[PDB]
Symmetry: C8
Amino acid sequence: MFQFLQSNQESFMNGICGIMALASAQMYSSFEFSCPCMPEYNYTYGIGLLIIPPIWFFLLGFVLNNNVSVLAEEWKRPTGRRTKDPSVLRYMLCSITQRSLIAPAVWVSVTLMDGKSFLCAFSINLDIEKFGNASLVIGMTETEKLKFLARIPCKDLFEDNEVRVAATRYIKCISQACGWMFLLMMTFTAFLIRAIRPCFTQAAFLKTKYWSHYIDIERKMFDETCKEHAKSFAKVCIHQYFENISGEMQNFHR
Amino acid sequence: MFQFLQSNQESFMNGICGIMALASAQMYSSFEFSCPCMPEYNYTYGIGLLIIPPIWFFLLGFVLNNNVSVLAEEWKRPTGRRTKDPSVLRYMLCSITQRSLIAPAVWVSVTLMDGKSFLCAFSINLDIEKFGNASLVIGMTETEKLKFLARIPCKDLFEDNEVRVAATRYIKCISQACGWMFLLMMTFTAFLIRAIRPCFTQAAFLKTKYWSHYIDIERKMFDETCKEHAKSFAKVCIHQYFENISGEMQNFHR
Amino acid sequence: MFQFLQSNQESFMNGICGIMALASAQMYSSFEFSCPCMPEYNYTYGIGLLIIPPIWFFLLGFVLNNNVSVLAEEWKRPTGRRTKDPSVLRYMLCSITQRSLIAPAVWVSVTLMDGKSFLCAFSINLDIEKFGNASLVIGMTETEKLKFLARIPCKDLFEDNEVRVAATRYIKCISQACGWMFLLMMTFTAFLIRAIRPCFTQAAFLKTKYWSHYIDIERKMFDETCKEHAKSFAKVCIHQYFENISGEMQNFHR
Amino acid sequence: MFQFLQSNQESFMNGICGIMALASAQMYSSFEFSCPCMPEYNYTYGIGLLIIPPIWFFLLGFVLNNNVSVLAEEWKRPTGRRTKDPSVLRYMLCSITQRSLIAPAVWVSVTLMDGKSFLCAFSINLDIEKFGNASLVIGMTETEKLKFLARIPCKDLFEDNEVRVAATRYIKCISQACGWMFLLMMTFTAFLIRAIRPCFTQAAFLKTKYWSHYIDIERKMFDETCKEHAKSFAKVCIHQYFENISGEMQNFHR
Amino acid sequence: MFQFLQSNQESFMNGICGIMALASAQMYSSFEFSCPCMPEYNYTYGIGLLIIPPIWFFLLGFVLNNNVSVLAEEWKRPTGRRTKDPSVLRYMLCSITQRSLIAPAVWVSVTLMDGKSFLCAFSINLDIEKFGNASLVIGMTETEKLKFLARIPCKDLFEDNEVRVAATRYIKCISQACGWMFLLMMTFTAFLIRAIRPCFTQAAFLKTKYWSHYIDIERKMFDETCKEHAKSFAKVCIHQYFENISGEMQNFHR
Amino acid sequence: MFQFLQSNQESFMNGICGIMALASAQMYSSFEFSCPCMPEYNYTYGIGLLIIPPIWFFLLGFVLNNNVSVLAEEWKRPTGRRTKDPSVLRYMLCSITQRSLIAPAVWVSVTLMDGKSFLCAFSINLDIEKFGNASLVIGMTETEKLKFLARIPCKDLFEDNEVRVAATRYIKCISQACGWMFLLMMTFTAFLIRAIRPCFTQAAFLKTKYWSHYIDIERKMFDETCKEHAKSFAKVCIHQYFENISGEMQNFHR
Amino acid sequence: MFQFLQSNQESFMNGICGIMALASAQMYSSFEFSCPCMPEYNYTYGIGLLIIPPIWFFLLGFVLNNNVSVLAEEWKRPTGRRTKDPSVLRYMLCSITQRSLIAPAVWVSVTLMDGKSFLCAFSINLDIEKFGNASLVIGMTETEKLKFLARIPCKDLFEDNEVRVAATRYIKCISQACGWMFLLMMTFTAFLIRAIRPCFTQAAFLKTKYWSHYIDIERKMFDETCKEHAKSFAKVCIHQYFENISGEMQNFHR
Amino acid sequence: MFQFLQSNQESFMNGICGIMALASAQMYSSFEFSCPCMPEYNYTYGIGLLIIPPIWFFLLGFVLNNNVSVLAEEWKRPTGRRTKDPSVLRYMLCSITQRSLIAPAVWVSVTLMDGKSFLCAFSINLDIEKFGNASLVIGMTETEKLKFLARIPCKDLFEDNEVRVAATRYIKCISQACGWMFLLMMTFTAFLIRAIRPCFTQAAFLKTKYWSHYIDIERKMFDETCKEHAKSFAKVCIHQYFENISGEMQNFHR
């Protein structure tokens, strides 16, 4: 689902959040899921791939946002020295935080729709009599059937394909149900935020918008002012260089 | 069917509704249908994939529409304070709702034409003597033949390929019949709305159109006014910075 | 046959009719034909896929045409109040109807050239002694040979491949003959309409052309007039906002 | 052979004839040849695919040409009322007819070079002792060997692959010989027409060229004249609408 | 070897000759060589595909050249009436003929480098004791070994793959030798023509160049003169039409 | 993940660092990992591919940066002669160093997520009783089981596929855990640097920015000044050349 | 190696020589090498493909160069009549010859690096005891082992794959060694020509450059002068044509 | 790794060196490595492919550089006649030499990372008891085991796949270690040259830059001066030609 905003870089309302949501789901495709298939490590691997990459995509939204240093500058300065109201600083932080949650939400949704994190984390929690022969886990210890159930996420380590296919379909169904409930709760949260909060936080929104435009203007105008103060002194140095070297370029190029 | 409006971004009359209908059907292709193949869970999985993603695509149409906060602002304000007639607010809500139903309708139609939601939900409702051997479901309990019929949507869990192919073709035929009746009822509803309602709701349409143009003008004009009020104060700060630092850039760059 | 008008969006004389004929044939390719292979349902499935999608493509031509609401407005108004002659309204309706029949005609032609609708609908009408062994349908009941002949459209439900290939080639030949006779009658109808009718309905054609140009002008001029009446009042509101907030932006950004 | 004029839309001298010749040969590729492989129907199928689609491509050249209605208008009008000489009308009809024969000629040539129409139509006319065993058609009736020879165009209905390959190569050779003689006669006819006729029909060519330019000018100038007469009356209606509604937009947007 | 002048339409000195040489070799690739593999017909098929398509590509160069009608006009007119010198007419004919020989030469060269025309035409002329077993053509009649050697161009009609591969490599070697000698003689002929003839036919070259530029100027200037004489009379007719119909458009659109 | 900044060369804030991070990960894909599968060399190969290419990508960032020669010029010059403050030189070096660490960090992350460097380096550290038969490493010497465990990274040198797949999944899990902890520590380091340091090193940042703009201005202005001093002397030499040679070009070209 | 100058048509210093070197190596790829695998013909086929196509690419460089007719004109004219010095004519011929040797050198290099011409020409010169069994060529005549060794370039005519692979690798190694020595001698020749000769042939280079610019100017200025002398006389003829025909177009188009 | 500078022809600082490094690595991919697999020739083939193509890419950098003739002109001229200082000539030669070493360094690095040159050159230096059975090279002569070890680079000449895979991985590891040490030494050499030498050779750099700009200006200004001196004399010749021929074009084109 990449060609849509790729061929339409106009449907955005912020650009870096659409790129990072695209990058979050493409990084899920490129990641090679390697469940340990051991009963000690399956839970932390499967749940860690649902928890740790969203934390990293969230921090990466703060690192890539170029207003977090200016906001950290204002919060470090003492009260009275601060040129901003505390509601404008709180609104600014809330704006950065809400755009930094898109790529974590994209990761959690592709992970739950794919079903592999639940298959790795919850295959030792199965009740295997619902899936095939009952004569599988008889004759085993409690320890040995935990090792048996832990190998269900691995095709080339689990030999009974019928029990593996039935247990994989059952867990991927529950994972897709959690993925649709996650999408539905986060979109209904997005609906209440985009309907109730602009009825409540107004003119902090207008001060934060003037603050954001002032930063982009101040950065650009400082760049072209440095360039015109360079062109004054660089013209002085270049012309003074050729005062002497063209005295040599007389005999050297004529 | 994606290259048509992809190479022709002129045949639209709204852009976000054509993108979301494209995204709805592409998300159906990317979704990996995983029927549980258990008689307790097949119905809720198959009917839930026909009900829950249309609800989510409907809410996503409200979240992506940038006039729902302005409409929620007007409805929250008391009567007398409201600058709008109640017919203009009702017409505005009806406009957002009708464009938010395109991507749900695209989902329901691709789901019924594909046939997998009916195959998952209705395979325990089959009468299997119409499809193959009669000696399949003899010798089974009522419980055991419900488990037998529940595995029909799964190729690698159902062994009799002739009975599976015959039952799959029968249910996919009924699903395609419901998909064509759904398309035909929703297009005939679209015909009656686009023929009778502009004979009845006129000049609310013209007030809602002026309201929509006024919002896009007010947002843009506020953006460029913030930028020109930034350029005044940013020019002051940059010039005052180089008053002192060019006093240092004397010895530092000459 | 899609790249031709795709790379040449100049050979048209109307754009939406070329897109919908392209979309009609691409939707035939994307549709997965699933004959029930049951003698009760084969006829209605095969003939329903030849009848019902053309009705839907015809209604979709009325829904996508933006002059059907203006025409419905004029017909609803009483005689005397109507600003148009009844011949101009009849000519207008005939213009919309003739362009709405292109995508139904494209569907019927690809369906008859493919041959699957006739194979599904007419395989129980076969005389199977023309195709293979005569010892197939002996020893069967009349009911059982109807079930035998109904499975001919299904490769994985019909076991005698020689009889299936011979019966499929016979019916696809007759379907292609009906497809060429359908194309030839509809093109000869198109020839008589585009030769005799502009000798008979003239100056209703010129009034309907002025009517169509007047609609596109009135819609566009209403859009830019709403935008310039927005820019007056939006400039008032934005300037009055910064009268007070720049009084705060004194201490807040200097 | 499509990328040539596709990437060079300058080598034309008429555009619709190059597109329809491209469309004629692409429609041959998309058509799935389905010989009946029955001795009653093979001739009419094979010769019908050589005769009927050229008739349809010829009529389609008349339907797509936008001067056939203006020519039909002039021929319907009585003598004396006709503003044109009869030689200009005859030259005009000959011009449309000659461009409408390109796509029929492309169809006949790809059909004869492919060889399938001759293979279907003429396989019961074979003398099968030239191709393999002589012991094939002994022990058969005259009726049964006609059914045997009719299945030669069908790989999956004819079992002796050596006799089938030899008979297919013999008939495809004769079909390619007829295809090269057809191309050579039609190109030599094109040479005599483009060398002798502009020595004989001159200044009817110049009157027909002025007639064709006059039509394209009259259609375009009528379109922009309708648009400027629309813009007069549409400006009146829009300005009169906002006389009253801006009286409401006082309190409604200030 | 198509992308070179496809991506560089500047390396030409005439455009239609580069397109037809490209089309000649692409038509060789698209042509399905079907040797009869019969000793009566192999020679005429193999040598006919080396002779007949070059004659057709040569005539097609005369048909596509738009100066052959103007040259045929001048030659038909009597001496004294002719406005041209006979050397200018002879030079003009020689110019058209030399550009019309490029696509025949491309056909002959791809046909000889591919080797199939010599393999078909000359396989009954082989001496098969140079290629495999000597015990192949003993026990055969002179008639039967001619049928045996005629099937060498056909993989699926000749069973001894070692003798077929050895005889195919021998004949394709001789065909490639004739193809390189053909290329070398035609390029050395092209060298002598482009070196000796512009030393001999000069100022007929300059009169023929002025003649060619005069034709392209006269055709274009006649086209725009017809269009400006159309715009005079079309403006008269359109304005006179709206004199009466705007008298009706008073009540009809106000 | 290459098409994102490839189709969007605007989301950058420096260009060479985005290219080198892209080149670092593409060089990982192109590198063919060839573990020695010997217990003496596996550790240094696997850990060397995690250490040595980041050192090389770090040095390559210094070589490709065009300000390291100007900074080396300033540091070589004695104190008092230096036109820059030591804080501006330290800030400049820190700026080059931080951008030169992106491609090393990309290499370490793709190497740990792929898992092959840990599989090569740590397969002799395994405890193989956790993975398959216990009867594998009995009957072996301590030397021989080190050779046995060293061949685990090699599919075609290790025969027990079940033990190899289980040991590969265990080590790739630990490698992906180290890769996520590495990404999380380096992004949290990037967060603290981009939040705390612009609160501490300011106006060295502004002097280093003026220094960087001054270099790009001085290089460009020296280039165009050399070109205009060339055009003076080149015009002299060319005109003086044709003073004599046009005296020869009189008789030579007239 | 085609996309480089294909996407960069700026790195050239002549265009036709880069195209012909590209065409020389692409023609090597398209050529199907067909060694006769006979001891009488292998040498002349293998060495002929190394000699004859370079001669043809050399002549093709003279045919495509548009200055060889002007140079042949000057050499044909007698001494005294010649407007050029003999050193300028010799320099001009040397310039055309050196650019015409690029495509021959590209052919020889791809042919020696591929190794097939040496494999065909030199396989009867092998000493086959270095490559496999010694019992191969015992029991054979001197004539029969020449036929045995001649079939080494043919995979499907030589049965011992180990001896064939060893002999092919040995000869392709020697061919690649000759290809690298050929590249190294021709590049060192190119170095001495581009270093010593512009120290020796100067101002013949400047006269030949003025001669080449004079030809391109004289051809273009003759083309536009013919076009403006056409536009004078074509305007006369077109206006005089419509003097009479607009007398008819009075009644014919009003 | 080609699309990077292919889609970004701006990241360069010289263009021909980036193209030749791209061409060096693409020529490595296109080269078919053919180890002789003979103990006399393996070393010179494997080490020759590491030595000889870098020498050729180095000379090709001198041939393609258009300043080596101007530098050779200055060095040939006697002292006193030389218009340049000897430090400017030495700096110029060092500039050409350093850019001509990029494509040799790219070749050596891809050759060492691929590992085939070390596999060919060093497989007779192996100690084969480290890799498989010890019973391989017993029963062989010293001569015969050299022939046995020489066939390790050839898959289809070495039969023990386990010993071949183990020996190939060992040598490719050592080759990749030498490739990383080569990259690291050449990049650290590039670091010391780009840091220490612009602190030492300055104003020879500025004279060599003015020299390079003067050459590009003098070549271009000589080209346009030849063209304007052509246009003077070509206008004279063309106008004088039509003085006489338009006297003939009176009767010939009127």
